[PDB]
Design a protein around this ligand. Structure first.
Ligand SMILES: [Cu+2]
Length: 124
């Protein structure tokens, strides 16, 4: 399955958002991060990627397709807008094994708020 996440200046949850900010996929699915607004990118957050994943960081304005192979929870940010809370979560598979690290990872306040809401939306 191939999914899309929009990078937006304004969305349902306010300014500087990924929509959807919460997504559950299967191993081998893809997610494309779409630069619907300019000025955004996607980057994995420190501490928020599972065993066997590779860190990643797109270029600003890049239409960025990730194939998710390693199971677990991924926290992503927009690099410039991380302090404004531009973040999202992708869960790959069921029963993610890296929740403790994910939940303990440090983040700016607005980021943490949105991450925690994304995680709760995933039933995590
Ligand atoms: Cu951004």
């Amino acid at each position: 399955a191939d999914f899309e996440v929009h990078m937006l200046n304004k969305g349902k949850d306010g300014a500087m958002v990924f929509e959807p900010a919460s997504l559950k996929v299967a191993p081998g699915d893809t997610v494309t991060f779409i630069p619907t607004d300019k000025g955004h990118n996607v980057e994995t957050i420190k501490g928020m990627i599972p065993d066997g994943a590779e860190a990643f960081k797109s270029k600003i304005n890049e239409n960025y397709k990730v194939t998710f192979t390693a199971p677990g929870v991924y926290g992503v940010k927009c690099t410039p807008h991380y302090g404004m809370g531009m973040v999202g979560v992708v869960q790959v598979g069921d029963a993610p094994a890296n929740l403790e690290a994910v939940k303990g990872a440090k983040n700016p306040k607005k980021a943490q708020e949105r991450l925690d809401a994304a995680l709760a939306a995933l039933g995590n």
